[PDB]
Amino acid sequence: GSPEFKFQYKEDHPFEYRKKEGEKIRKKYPDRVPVIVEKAPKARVPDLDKRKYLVPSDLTVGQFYFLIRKRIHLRPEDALFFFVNNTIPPTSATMGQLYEDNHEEDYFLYVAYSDESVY
């Protein structure tokens, strides 16, 4: 295929493809979950070529946040907030906990990141 940089609205329409993709990746990697990576407005964070990712279900939210913090090389004083499908889980939860809470007919997980929480 080809790389693209567009919002979820693109894959929000082909429900048949979104399901097929979720179904194939669920069977290919059931110990992992497909995650959408998107930056929210008002943020002050660098961009990286990451749109669609796959993470293990057993990864603790605090650890996951740390890996991405180090990935974006933010200052230690730099604020950072993550939102999984409009919700804010505790850092003691795991990717499998939020994946269960977000279980959909498409089987995709949406994750947003920002410097400040501003709709």
Binding site: E16, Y17, E21, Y29, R32, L54
Partner: peptide
Amino acid sequence: GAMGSASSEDYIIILPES
């Protein structure tokens, strides 16, 4: 449609041997 791939679908996995 009906997909007929061989290679897995495009998704960046982040899972090293560690």
